[PDB]
DNA sequence: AGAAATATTAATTTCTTAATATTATCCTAAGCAAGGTCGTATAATGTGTGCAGTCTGACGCGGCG
């Protein structure tokens, strides 16, 4: 309840395009089927969502998904966003160079 | 049943190359404002420190008879 009242502005559904995200229930949309997301995947997902529209910082994300005990030496948040826009489409993840990357809403 | 060891899918670093698109040097041409020099033909022809308040006592020393 807390997160959601905060980072989703107090929703429990995330409307962007034919992606609607249930944060309470874990459940991802494209369209109206059911996607099977690994969990990093689904934490990417769900920040890029919450703050829809603005490009989220690289280390934003890379502390998101990664606690602060296991830190990878290698390229693992270009992988892991990599998989998310197979499993979503090269259109709605938005690569934006220095600054992370960016879910498109128009 | 409550763990207690095992086989599977499955979520995941790790390189690797290529690649792929973005992005940031670079470099020279050119341009514009700024800084430096010349050129002036009525005639014009010598000076300001514009003073300075005796400090001072030996003392050096150059004279100085």
């Given at each position: 309840?807390?997160?959601?009242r ?18 309470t ?17 689904y934490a ?15 280390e ?21 966003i ?8 090269k ?16």
């Open positions: 309840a807390l997160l959601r905060h980072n989703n502005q107090g929703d429990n559904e995330i409307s962007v395009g034919n992606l609607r995200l249930n944060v229930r874990r459940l991802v949309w494209l369209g109206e089927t059911a996607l099977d997301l690994t969990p990093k995947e990417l997902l769900s920040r890029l969502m919450m703050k829809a529209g603005s490009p989220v910082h690289r934003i994300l890379y502390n998101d998904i990664y606690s602060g005990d296991n830190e990878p030496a290698t390229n693992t948040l270009e992988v892991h990599h998989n998310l826009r197979e499993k979503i489409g259109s709605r993840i938005r690569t934006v160079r220095g600054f992370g990357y960016m879910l498109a809403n128009n």
